[PDB]
Symmetry: D2
Subunit: 484 residues, 4 copies
């Protein structure tokens, strides 16, 4: 069918070997993707290094920002093509792609272009022993070549979340999208080319991780930084890989996030909110709630309500009427998720709903669908309650006391996000500050202001991105001290 | 003299002890107790528990007041700290009195003040339902901070990490260099006497591999590791903490250049390069071991620096008009001399020094070397590309501005650079093109503690100082309220 | 018993003096020397000259250190300051010990700390020739700051202006209220003893119109006039400095509302509104003279507040259990009692108070009034729209959230508002809709000195506090270097 | 043509009208309708109401998008705006195409962008009960912004105020100079076509006293008055708004100095001072009317500048290589020529110029004057101390750096200064000592829109630009939540 090429030094190029891109809706082949080899990865990095010395390196911040807005214009001009690409790779509902995924990719470019135009640095005056003084001023310069490695959860959103600030800060880029979701990134390369982005500034390499393009990229001494979103264990691997070169790193690594529903929550809103936080993108978001804590006084009503709403969810085709959930990303990921579904039963869970695979009795049975699933009855120490599944699942447990639930939320090796439901003013601020995570939402979930710091604690990450945090990470911060 | 660990509010010995040796005369100063894995665990657990005790309940203002009390404690025992630092390292008493100890005090006071005045951000946004949302950020303590520090500027560097760590409400497990354990031990006494709650500040003594340093980096209970020292050690530590994805902050030395343009105040530049090459006997990460001087003033510059270099007094720390003490250790002298010989083998001209002075007293059992200047090596020579960390510099002529910028940047390191020029445009044009974290113009190692400090390439990861320290030593959390 | 001016490093008398009267008993406390136009000129010229003296050459660190010594000086004479504030105003000794004097000290320390830690901005831009330019900003002293303060919280308000003025390196000519001259005079002594150079801080006593206050505002040698007091006086001062285009900053009182929603913690709201209505006998610009209570809890709220108001002990500043002292002066009492009468004529129900207590002792020669609560007036009544500045509130029921927001905002003033609610969305939704400079939720007059402070409409111009004071009391200069 | 008011979404005429006259040739360009007091009231009331309409409901993002569409609209009619600016003022077409119109576009885009990216502050504090509090600040629209602008840079200065006003969500009543009403009227058309809701932007035409300008300043319905123009007028306006305590922001011109040090690039400095003295025929608030040149290069500088001034082409706005058009009006020429005479009477040597060119065509009916250079005047001469606002400069020698700093600062004005020097230290040392809001080194009027812009002394009150505009055109509110 279609073919997805690498984009290296201003040219789309094939490779000696290719791999299949499979549609998870029906198991069908979508495209062949050309896997970049070590030589092609080197060529990309070298091209990126050289482009720093070319026209790109000479652009004013204003001209750079203008070109980045042109990249965003180019995505907007091919909006439905990008929607189609993202949907084909992942099975996500078309409505989700049209409202979350593709708009956020456009917004990523525009916001960081704007931040680049408006951001400034610092001036520090000091006295000296001779009485004449000195001036210290800081500047932001490009860090150099940014290696970007992104996952399949929100392919274009996460890819552009890294590529946008990288380019806004005047860096050049070598970027490796997930082998599961290569299409929109390839379309993005086309937009870059058509927008007139100079050769070598943006390079797209396809492939896998170990023994493939991903590993080749992290090991290349020519990069200045590696920014990554994906599995915690992969973060550790990458951190070791770049250590000999002391490369700058930025990791967002998923979690085992909790939602907490206090007795004073708006109960219908909380049920809807937890439905969203547990089952959005079929549970395949690092920010999803796989643990839910509900006050004992409302526990039964909450569980019954969520069961009903989960069973109301339409699981099916991306453009099907009223669809809420598509499949998992791949048969391989479904294997992991189903193994946890089995483990929960073995650990003594009550399966409130789901727990298996829907039977469609059509081509979708060859796809990688699972049921939205709710568990109760597990202890806080069960594997299914402590390890990240990354499926459309949550376990629900009662609690009695505010300090109790705070400690239970924090009793985790992860620390990415938490969502709290309460109508009480003091409770909202008092509890949120005590949760050991990078991101707290109160009475909502995954509401994003791109200027805010975003990241996690513990195994969930290293560093922050977003707003000034990205402007700092993707820049060399240099202090220049002038003796007067 | 005995130096004990300080764990959970108590001074404790260990099963193993090692020698602390004065580098001036090779004499024994103290027995130092080496923390084992069990004690390192005891320290981290104590620090974890201290976050949940009285320390964790202090307001930012009360926390800052207590930190100013630590600073008062150092000031009150000022000469004791001076003598501890001098005994360990052989540094001139005058340097200890003007740089090392006052900076330690200033580190605590500055970060205490930054903590009092610092604030975070508020972002407003609109939502679909027309009600809006607000996102605000807060800085919280990161948790337990692991601190591993080197011997170059013992108390200064130790407190450069410990002060912001405490100011941000963290607890600390700190391991000073086995070569300079004394002032950190006296700090533990000041902390105790100021009434810092047990577990908040813990001091562990020992080495790196198979010792307290390694055990600290491997401990799952810490939240960050901040480190200053050798680049290869940074790499090792970065691998060590990777499985726990710990926050890291590294300053890793370098091979720094000074550049003297033809329009420099020549006398000021000679004096400045003498300072940047030979301060603390050249044992500062920021020292200029490479110097580039415009061809038109090269001979005059080299001659002038030779004269000044040979006027330097190498002797006892309290000796009249002393300029230089010994190197930190005989082991370090072995490294440095090995480089002295390598320079000759590489075809260098030895403008001055190149050996060790002869004292005919106890100092001959110490670890002294001479201030040394080389010329005549190529840019690819090992002696011009590898960090020596001794009182040495190589001087090379250059002709063009773009040329020297490229030669300065042609390095796997990238910590600092000092530029000498009287020209306005040149200062700003050139400074911005040097690939380092820190540039000084017409000075060297002039420090405003609010500024970002750190390196690029093999010279580091991250920035500390001012708000960069307030961010690194804090959990930054975003709280989003849907209205 | 005699209060002198402090001009160019010397305490000086004047040709005329006026009486300082104790409002507890109407007795004479001291005679105060009134600065004439000639002495006001002498003060401004000395302040101009001090800018060129040792004060001008101090580093920001040395300046901050000295300001901390001023604070130390107040702390060393803490009880004398308490006695001074209490004598002039009749405020309870407990209030003076807990609010007034500690805030004056905190004012100096906080702005000293901000001076030490604050920095400015660097902007890079590209140019036609490809070489670029740098713009950087600096904060410099504005010059001579004229400070005019009121009698409400005499030392607190005086130092609220003097502390940032001095922290930013200005020199100062300051005129405290004729009603409360004592603590400002003691402050002059602290400055003197602290070694603040002559001319840096000058104290001038007197009245407003046709006296020291007027003369100061009309002097061409000042660089700014900061003022807290009556709104119409703000307008007068704004016209007075206009020909010189002087920088101005005004906080001008108001007619503040407290709002108690049906979901409020009722007991907390009652105690809260007791504080916000009767603190300092209702003589604070931030006091709530209008109160809106949801009709479901209206009767219960008014009953509870009546009981608590009637439990207030009104009396001597050192009286066991005293809660309220007198009004500042007989003349101010005349105004307040005029409003007490007007309220009755306007149809008010007097829930409690409404007159003067009968003590049958020397307090009857003082300026006491009763804490007072009204109900039953229209939103357009004079007693509900005009600032009384006494220990009084009118309470009105309301039904709807949008209704009460509009009623709060229906005012020519806009200083502060206190809102009582336990609902998360309501707190943030309502607070952002109130047209004032300052909103408190579930509290009142809780002050973080870093925050912007000021009013809208007739309640002010500009903001002070934190960075806003650092900006106002500074020349902000932009320096652009073409490279 | 005919230029109408734009009020509540409609173009409207008036009872009275006045002439718009081309200063190149004295010909009538348009009739302009003068808004009366009734119409000013209608505009302010329309602005107040528009705050409660769809404008007030827009998200910051949607508001910024709309402002970007305003900018798009000006760009889409770029040459129409150019022709309008040129017709009114006689400015060179090249200047209008490179400075005036592009800056108007950039004004809207920059403040739209700043609105999108700017945020506010979060401060945490501890309280007695140990539960804590949080203070967060928000930026809200101030309300109705009155804008009064002058004829020096008509659309640039008009949009410099209107853009941040709209970006901060205010509504606007704006009064452009009677001398240059065209581009503002075109801007009203752009707003209308972009779909800016009725009442959000209102344009009123007329004069000052007893006309639209005065009526606007006296209207109690405005929330602020921002103004650029003559110092005396700023003073008058400051008095006019005083009774309402309206927020004010003033930039008020000056008597700016250029300084040329002996180490300057002399050719660059000659070119630089040519630009700073004669750009827009010297009709910019920032122009250098005083020049100080080191004695050692004084003669060479003056001869060089004389030659370059005499090569300036004075003539038609679209003439081949024109450098200078006429002055704004015959009335302004009367003022400027009166100063030309006065300089001679004060004993000046007329190095070049001093009269009016003879064209022998329609330009003789215009308002042209010659670029003029004087020498030989005292620092106290009227022509050296009073703003002329024509294409003139006086040049005086100096000997010492501290001397020249004092001479530059010896002025009742303090807007800007340009300094020429190749020395690094001198650039930073001297710039910091000049008592003005704006310093340029080795350039002049190089603008980064994010930087603070304003003057000291009689040259202004407040700063605008970047965050300073975001603060001025907003209500800053502090919301304190007790937890
Ligand atoms: N950046 C600097 O300021 C700095 C300071 C001193 C030395 N150095 C460089 O390194 C050389 C010094 O030798 P060194 O052994 O003292 O440097 P080092 O970097 O190995 O030692 C620094 C600190 O880290 C500890 N450490 C060493 N190995 C460790 C490990 N595997 N895990 C945890 N901690 C470990 C040490 O005990 C010591 O406290 C010098 O020649 C110089 O080039 C740099
Ligand atoms: N905002 C506040 O904190 C505050 C404080 C005190 C009083 N007030 C209000 O004002 C009334 C008090 O009367 P007041 O006379 O004491 O207030 P005032 O505003 O007239 O006096 C305040 C200060 O300004 C000075 N002053 C007065 N007129 C002046 C003038 N024309 N030029 C220069 N300085 C002048 C005074 O001497 C005093 O130091 C109260 O009833 C109350 O409503 C407000
Ligand atoms: O040996 C390296 C020196 C580091 C200096 C600092 O960290 C400092 O001065 O803050
Ligand atoms: O005539 C006065 C100059 C005004 C310039 C500006 O306000 C600007 O360039 O922003
Ligand atoms: Na796929
Ligand atoms: Na030692
Ligand atoms: Na009195
Ligand atoms: Na005209």
């Amino acid at each position: 069918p279609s073919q997805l090429l690498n984009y290296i030094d201003g040219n789309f190029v094939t490779s000696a070997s290719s791999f299949a891109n499979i549609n998870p809706v029906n198991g069908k082949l979508i495209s062949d993707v050309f896997e970049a080899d070590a030589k092609q990865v080197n060529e990309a990095v070298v091209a990126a290094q050289n482009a720093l010395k070319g026209p790109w390196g000479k652009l004013s911040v204003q001209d750079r920002a203008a070109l980045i807005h042109k990249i965003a214009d180019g995505i907007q001009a091919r909006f439905e093509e990008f929607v189609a690409a993202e949907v084909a790779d992942t099975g996500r509902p078309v409505h989700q792609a049209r409202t979350l995924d593709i708009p956020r990719a456009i917004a990523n470019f525009r916001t960081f272009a704007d931040l680049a135009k408006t951001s400034h640095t610092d001036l520090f005056e000091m006295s000296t022993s001779d009485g004449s003084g000195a001036l210290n001023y800081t500047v932001r310069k490009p860090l150099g070549v940014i290696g970007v490695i992104s996952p399949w959860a929100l392919p274009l959103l996460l890819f552009t979340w890294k590529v946008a600030p990288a380019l806004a800060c005047g860096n050049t880029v070598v970027a490796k999208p997930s082998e599961e979701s290569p299409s929109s990134a390839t379309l993005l390369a086309e937009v870059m080319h058509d927008a007139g982005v100079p050769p070598g500034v943006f390079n797209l390499i396809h492939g896998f991780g170990k023994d493939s393009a991903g590993e080749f990229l992290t090991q290349h001494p020519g990069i200045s930084a590696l920014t990554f979103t994906g599995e915690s264990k992969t973060g550790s691997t990458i951190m070791k890989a770049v250590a000999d070169g002391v490369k700058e790193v930025s990791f967002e690594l998923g979690g085992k996030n909790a939602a907490v529903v206090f007795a004073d929550a708006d109960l219908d809103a909380a049920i809807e909110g937890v439905l969203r936080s547990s089952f959005t993108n079929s549970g395949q978001v690092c920010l999803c709630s796989e643990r839910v804590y509900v006050h004992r006084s409302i526990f039964d009503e909450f569980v019954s309500g969520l069961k009903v709403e989960a069973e109301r969810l339409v699981v099916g085709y991306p453009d099907q009427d009223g669809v809420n959930m598509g499949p998992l990303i791949s048969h391989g990921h479904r294997d992991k998720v189903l193994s946890y579904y089995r483990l929960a039963v073995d650990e003594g869970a009550t399966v409130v709903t789901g727990g298996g695979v829907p039977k469609f009795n059509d081509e979708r049975d060859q796809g990688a669908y699972v049921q939205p699933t709710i568990w109760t009855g597990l202890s806080d120490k069960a594997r299914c309650v402590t390890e990240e599944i990354f499926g459309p699942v949550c376990h629900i447990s009662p609690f009695d006391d505010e300090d109790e639930v705070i400690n239970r939320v924090n009793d985790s090796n992860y620390g990415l996000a938490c969502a709290i439901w309460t109508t009480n003013l003091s409770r909202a601020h008092r509890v949120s500050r005590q949760i050991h995570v990078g991101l707290v939402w109160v009475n909502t979930w995954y509401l994003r202001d791109l200027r805010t710091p975003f990241g996690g604690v513990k195994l969930s990450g290293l560093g922050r991105e977003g707003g000034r945090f990205s402007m700092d990470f993707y820049s060399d911060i240099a202090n220049i001290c002038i003796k007067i």
